[PDB]
Ligand binder design. Structure first.
Ligand SMILES: CCCCCCSC[C@H](NC(=O)CC[C@H]([NH3+])C(=O)O)C(=O)NCC(=O)O
Ligand SMILES: CCCCCCSC[C@H](NC(=O)CC[C@H]([NH3+])C(=O)O)C(=O)NCC(=O)O
Lengths: 217, 217
């Protein structure tokens, strides 16, 4: 079994847990829990961070024999390479590179927001530029089944997480309907994914750590 | 001729310009200029922004015929693949992926400090954490000539830049005296790199936008 370590929260590990589940990778999880509210008690993780033999300790991490990685994108590319779920053609690789990076810029934007004490003050500007961000992704996907072509890749798990989060935030966003929605329905109908979602291991929320103003429940 | 677009400063395009120079790729630059102070109106960019045919409009961007890219790392990979500058084995790909991602974490924590209006009060904590981050990077490299191995990859162009930045913000750092310094010293002695750093187009500053509280022009 491979070991995935991350906080007992959705966050940056969602796409990794889904990929691990789809590619049928035997795994276990180390889900670090919190302690005394409301004082930030990372101790469960902190008591273990500098004793795992990781080169750049962080969350999430994945241990697979002597392979010890940190950096979520790196863990994905690692899992994906064992099942050829990275690009194959040059153009597919460019589409993968550009989106993995772009999806992180949108993930951080959102993260920044739900974390700021000025959330309600920032919410309107954010929603002002959401639609356009979504139109871009819709235009990029076009009529393809997946973000790169007919081949499903790790960037599709990334895209699903990021889009499902935005769907969480604003459930009836016009730009969310259309090819973006069908994409979501396309992802959730994948056999091992459907099965994972109806299992008792799947955690749809909370998206963020307990200190977040939006969705920490 | 590929066209690299970005503001007329060093910023996030440093690693790319060095990779292009070293690879001997013929290129051209579309430097975007900011209006006079304190306005710094960036209309030179927004004017062209949605007229380039880029999927996700942003700076830097790279246009090579029908190839049009916008995320720095993806642009670096695009070039790197053409010259076998990514990893060639599983272990090398892992070092490439983890590093490419950790160095982005490093760069951003630094852009945040230097762009925050609280710089001077944040500066102490940043310095107090630095020696650990440098030591980590030093343990990783070990007695290797390059970060990935005995062959130069694009991640060395990143490490050189993230590190060069730190050398400039705290030259007197002990952590930076060791193999890390031999690495920079080695990077700078490469035929096309040195040939470059002495040219008239080479620019070591400013690292940040004119609005930053540290190093600008
Ligand atoms: C609750 C999730 C909210 C999402 C944003 C914060 S992620 C949490 C944070 N991890 C990181 O910053 C890692 C980022 C890194 N770029 C990666 O991709 O792995 C952590 O707790 N690291 C542990 C540590 O640094 O000790
Ligand atoms: C060492 C870092 C120095 C920082 C200098 C400015 S970074 C560029 C700035 N912000 C970006 O996010 C662009 C970079 C993009 N995120 C990438 O990863 O390639 C921009 O002009 N983006 C274009 C836009 O938003 O219009």
């Amino acid at each position: 079994v491979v070991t995935l370590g991350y906080w007992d929260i959705r966050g940056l590990a969602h796409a990794i847990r889904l990929l691990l589940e789809y590619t049928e990778t035997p795994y276990q999880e180390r889900r670090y829990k919190a302690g005394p509210a409301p004082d930030f008690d990372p101790s469960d993780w902190t008591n273990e961070k500098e004793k795992l033999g990781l080169d750049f300790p962080n969350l999430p991490y994945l241990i697979d024999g002597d392979v010890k990685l940190t950096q979520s994108n790196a863990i994905l590319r690692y899992i994906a390479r064992k099942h050829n779920m990275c690009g194959e053609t040059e153009v597919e690789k460019q589409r993968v590179d550009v989106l993995e990076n772009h999806l992180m810029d949108l993930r951080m934007a959102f993260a920044r927001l739900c974390y700021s004490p000025d959330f309600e003050k920032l919410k309107p500007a954010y929603l002002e530029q959401l639609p356009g961000k979504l139109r871009q992704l819709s235009r990029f996907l076009g009529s393809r089944s997946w973000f790169v072509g007919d081949k499903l890749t790790f960037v599709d798990f990334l895209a699903y997480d990021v889009l499902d989060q935005q769907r969480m935030f604003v459930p009836d966003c016009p730009e969310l309907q259309g090819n973006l929605s069908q994409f979501l329905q396309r992802f959730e109908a994948l056999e091992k994914i459907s099965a994972y979602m109806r299992s008792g291991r799947f955690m749809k929320a909370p998206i963020f750590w307990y200190t977040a103003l939006w969705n920490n429940k």
